[PDB]
Each structure stands twice: as structure tokens, then as C-alpha cells.
Design an enzyme around this catalytic site. Structure first.
Site, PDB file in Angstrom:
ATOM      1  N   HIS A  80       0.836  -1.224   0.000  1.00  0.00           N
ATOM      2  CA  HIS A  80       0.000   0.000   0.000  1.00  0.00           C
ATOM      3  C   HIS A  80       0.866   1.267   0.000  1.00  0.00           C
ATOM      4  CE1 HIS A  80      -3.098  -2.972   1.307  1.00  0.00           C
ATOM      5  NE2 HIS A  80      -3.740  -2.321   0.352  1.00  0.00           N
ATOM      6  N   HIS A  84       1.673   1.590  -5.789  1.00  0.00           N
ATOM      7  CA  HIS A  84       0.259   1.156  -5.855  1.00  0.00           C
ATOM      8  C   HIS A  84      -0.630   2.334  -6.274  1.00  0.00           C
ATOM      9  CE1 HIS A  84      -3.549  -0.686  -4.787  1.00  0.00           C
ATOM     10  NE2 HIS A  84      -3.793   0.239  -3.868  1.00  0.00           N
ATOM     11  N   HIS A 118      -5.802   7.559  -2.732  1.00  0.00           N
ATOM     12  CA  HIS A 118      -6.782   6.727  -2.052  1.00  0.00           C
ATOM     13  C   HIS A 118      -6.258   5.842  -0.896  1.00  0.00           C
ATOM     14  CE1 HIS A 118      -5.183   3.389  -4.341  1.00  0.00           C
ATOM     15  NE2 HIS A 118      -5.897   2.593  -3.569  1.00  0.00           N
ATOM     16  N   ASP A 119      -4.937   5.645  -0.790  1.00  0.00           N
ATOM     17  CA  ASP A 119      -4.343   4.824   0.281  1.00  0.00           C
ATOM     18  C   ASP A 119      -3.305   5.649   1.051  1.00  0.00           C
ATOM     19  OD1 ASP A 119      -5.552   2.237   0.442  1.00  0.00           O
ATOM     20  OD2 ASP A 119      -4.385   1.498  -1.254  1.00  0.00           O
ATOM     21  N   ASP A 229      -8.452  -0.310  -8.046  1.00  0.00           N
ATOM     22  CA  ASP A 229      -7.723  -0.704  -6.801  1.00  0.00           C
ATOM     23  C   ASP A 229      -7.228  -2.149  -6.941  1.00  0.00           C
ATOM     24  OD1 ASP A 229      -8.657  -0.604  -3.213  1.00  0.00           O
ATOM     25  OD2 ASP A 229      -6.771  -0.270  -4.271  1.00  0.00           O
ATOM     26  N   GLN A 281      -6.183 -17.428  -3.515  1.00  0.00           N
ATOM     27  CA  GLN A 281      -6.213 -16.554  -4.683  1.00  0.00           C
ATOM     28  C   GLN A 281      -7.429 -16.956  -5.507  1.00  0.00           C
ATOM     29  OE1 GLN A 281      -4.232 -13.856  -5.997  1.00  0.00           O
ATOM     30  NE2 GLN A 281      -3.981 -13.842  -3.758  1.00  0.00           N
TER      31      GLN A 281
HETATM   32  C1  LIG Z   1      -6.667  -9.921  -0.947  1.00  0.00           C
HETATM   33  C2  LIG Z   1      -6.182  -9.411  -2.284  1.00  0.00           C
HETATM   34  C3  LIG Z   1      -5.612 -10.292  -3.199  1.00  0.00           C
HETATM   35  C4  LIG Z   1      -5.163  -9.841  -4.438  1.00  0.00           C
HETATM   36  N1  LIG Z   1      -4.614 -10.687  -5.321  1.00  0.00           N
HETATM   37  C5  LIG Z   1      -5.282  -8.497  -4.774  1.00  0.00           C
HETATM   38  C6  LIG Z   1      -5.847  -7.614  -3.860  1.00  0.00           C
HETATM   39  C7  LIG Z   1      -6.298  -8.065  -2.621  1.00  0.00           C
HETATM   40  O1  LIG Z   1      -6.841  -7.191  -1.769  1.00  0.00           O
HETATM   41 NI    NI Z   2      -5.622   0.559  -2.702  1.00  0.00          NI
HETATM   42 NI    NI Z   3      -7.280   0.963   0.651  1.00  0.00          NI
END
Ligand SMILES: Cc1cc(N)ccc1O
Ligand code: NI
Ligand code: NI
Length: 330
Positions: A80, A84, A118-119, A229, A281
Site C-alpha cells: 500500500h 500502488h 486513495h491509500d 484498486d 487466490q
Molecule cells: C486480498 C487481495 C488479493 C489480491 N490478489 C489483490 C488484492 C487483494 O486485496
Molecule cells: Ni488501494
Molecule cells: Ni485501501
């Protein structure tokens, strides 16, 4: 404790930047990976703002100040982080470029800025953690805890001397854009995504979806935020797989903290349970990513390449589970 501010040399250097010709073409595509071009990320954002919103949408000085202070208020966390932020902003650019006249000038500027911010000041801990263990942030913000903080950080940065890129908007448009941003940032709370996508699917299927309806617009923007996101899942497989390593680095660090306080973490945040990652996943793609891009593709058909790519990556995780995996690095 406190808002960071970029140096004179930082923002002045950004104003000089020009985007290499080869990247001009590549940056338009949904699958573009900013990864190999770190020195260029601020310049890439300026470029996107200028192409989507116009070279005079913002005073260049203030925008360059703003970008470099945003960068400075992302933490050196595994996922984060600043990379990103720029990745999510690039996804939004591709969506807006493909759907340009659906959105107003004010919406395009607000959403590109919301994605970059946003983060902001993420510390590498989830809402689950802050709430379970009563961090001060969870007292201040009972729901969508981190997202409300990211918005507060955005407003804090705008309020820095020379940093208010929106100050030349009329008072009415200034309130509007701040609300666009607030809504867009809060919509990045995945808790809210499940209900939003369900509402949108039904609206789409019954034919009641209407983008002249403000509440509908807000929800469509919310789903665009989720899509951006999550867009690591829409890149080429090697990029997606490497990004997963960064995401899990954060999760595992949080898991370690839960262990210290006498709580077994969810398997996802347990670094001693890496064998469960492929199944995890799969769950995420089936429950979250595929539905998101499927609904987004229905509403905005030009976003179909995101869905194609997500489906391709799901097929790759299924390959991992079957043991058909080939070579990877870190
Ligand atoms: C939990 C999660 C997995 C992935 N691959 C991408 C974003 C996420 O929040
Ligand atoms: Ni994000
Ligand atoms: Ni976030």
C-alpha cells in the site's frame, strides 16, 4: 505524526519532465505496467492529468507540489505504497480515456486525484486489525476506518501552502469535487463493494441503471474505484504474480502481530501457511475480482480487456493448483 511536504528541488524537477515517446502509446493500454519506470511515476501522473483533463486544468506549480507531497505521504510499506497509488491512477486513466464523455471534466480530475490519494499514509494494517484491537483510528472512524483516514490525509495535503490544486474552481464546483473524491475514496473499502456490485448488477439487468441519476453515477464510480484498486489482477501473469508477493508481505507482517496478542491470524495473514495461497487466490478471483470486472464490462463495455486479463490470471492460479507452475523470481 503529521503531514509531510515535498522539497523545492522535488517539485521543480517534476515540472521539467517530458514523457519518452515510446511510453505515450503504451500508457493508453489497460495492461500497461508502470513497474519498470519508477523515476517517471510522478511525470506519468502529470501526463495523464494533462491528457484527460487538459494542460491548464491545474496550475502546474501547485499540481507538481501536490503530487510530490502525496508521494512523500505514502509509507515505505511492501504494497500500500506510492507504486500502488500510481498503478491505480493509471487504471482509472485507461478507463476514463475509453469512456471519456460519460464523465464530466470535474469527475475526471477528481477521480484521477482520488486514485492517487486513495491509500495515503497506509501503515500496512487492515481495517480488521485496527478495529479488533481498538486503534485510535477505529475510535475516530467507526466504519471504513482507513478509507476515512485516507480522505482526511488528502484534505490535509490540499490545505498545505501552495498545494490546493482546486482553489480556482467556483465555490460550488469545489464542494462538488471534494465530495466526488470523498465518495470515491470511501468506495475503496471492499466491505462496501459487495453490496454495490449487487445493486449495480440488478439495476443493469432490470434496465433501471441511469447515469443521469446522481446515486447511480456514484455507484458506477464506486465500482470503477474497485476495478482500479484491484487492477494488479489484470496485468500480464508475471506482473500479477510478483505483485502478489508484495501484498502477502504486508499480510504476513500483520499476522505476526496478531500472534503476539494471542490470536491465530486468518490463514491469509499467516506466513506459516503459504501452501494455502493458491486456493486463497482462487477464492478471491471467484468471489471478488471476476464479479467486479464482469459487472464493470456490462456497464462500460470498453473495459472488457480488464475482464479478459482477470480471467487469464484465474486460469494461471488454477495451473498453480494443478502443479503445472513454471519459473518465477523475487
Ligand atoms: C486480498 C487481495 C488479493 C489480491 N490478489 C489483490 C488484492 C487483494 O486485496
Ligand atoms: Ni488501494
Ligand atoms: Ni485501501
Amino acid at each position: 505524526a503529521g503531514t509531510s511536504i515535498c522539497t523545492s528541488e522535488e517539485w521543480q524537477g517534476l515540472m521539467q519532465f517530458t514523457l519518452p515517446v515510446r511510453l505515450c502509446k503504451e500508457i493508453e493500454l489497460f495492461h500497461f505496467d508502470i513497474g519498470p519506470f519508477e523515476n517517471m511515476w510522478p511525470g506519468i501522473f502529470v501526463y495523464m492529468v494533462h491528457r484527460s483533463c487538459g494542460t491548464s486544468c491545474f496550475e502546474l506549480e501547485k499540481l507538481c507540489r501536490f503530487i510530490m507531497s502525496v508521494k512523500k505521504n505514502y509509507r515505505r510499506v511492501p504494497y500500500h505504497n506510492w507504486k500502488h497509488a500510481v498503478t491505480v491512477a493509471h487504471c482509472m486513466y485507461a478507463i476514463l480515456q475509453n469512456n471519456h464523455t460519460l464523465f464530466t471534466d470535474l469527475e475526471r480530475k477528481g477521480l484521477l486525484i482520488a486514485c492517487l490519494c486513495h491509500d495515503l499514509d497506509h501503515r500496512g494494517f487492515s481495517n480488521s486489525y485496527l478495529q479488533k484491537f481498538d486503534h485510535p483510528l477505529a475510535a475516530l472512524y467507526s466504519t471504513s476506518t482507513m478509507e476515512q483516514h485516507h480522505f482526511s490525509q488528502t484534505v490535509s495535503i490540499l490545505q498545505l501552502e501552495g498545494h490546493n490544486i482546486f482553489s480556482t474552481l467556483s465555490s460550488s464546483e469545489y464542494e462538488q469535487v471534494l465530495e466526488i473524491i470523498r465518495k470515491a475514496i470511501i468506495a475503496t473499502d471492499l466491505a462496501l463493494y459487495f453490496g454495490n456490485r449487487k445493486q449495480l448488477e440488478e439495476m443493469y439487468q432490470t434496465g433501471s441503471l441511469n447515469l443521469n441519476n446522481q446515486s447511480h453515477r456514484d455507484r458506477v464510480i464506486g465500482l470503477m474505484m474497485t476495478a482500479c484498486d484491484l487492477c494488479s489482477v489484470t496485468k500480464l501473469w508475471p506482473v500479477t504474480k510478483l505483485t502478489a508477493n508484495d501484498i502477502y508481505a504486508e499480510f504476513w507482517a500483520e499476522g505476526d502481530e496478531m500472534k503476539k496478542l494471542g490470536i491465530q491470524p486468518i490463514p491469509m495473514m499467516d506466513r506459516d501457511k503459504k501452501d494455502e495461497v493458491p486456493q486463497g487466490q482462487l477464492g478471491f478471483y471467484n468471489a471478488v475480482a471476476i464479479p467486479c470486472y464482469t459487472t464493470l464490462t456490462q456497464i462500460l463495455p470498453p473495459t472488457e480487456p480488464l475482464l479478459k486479463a482477470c480471467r487469464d490470471n484465474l486460469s494461471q492460479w488454477e495451473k498453480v493448483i494443478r502443479g503445472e507452475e513454471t519459473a518465477t523470481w523475487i
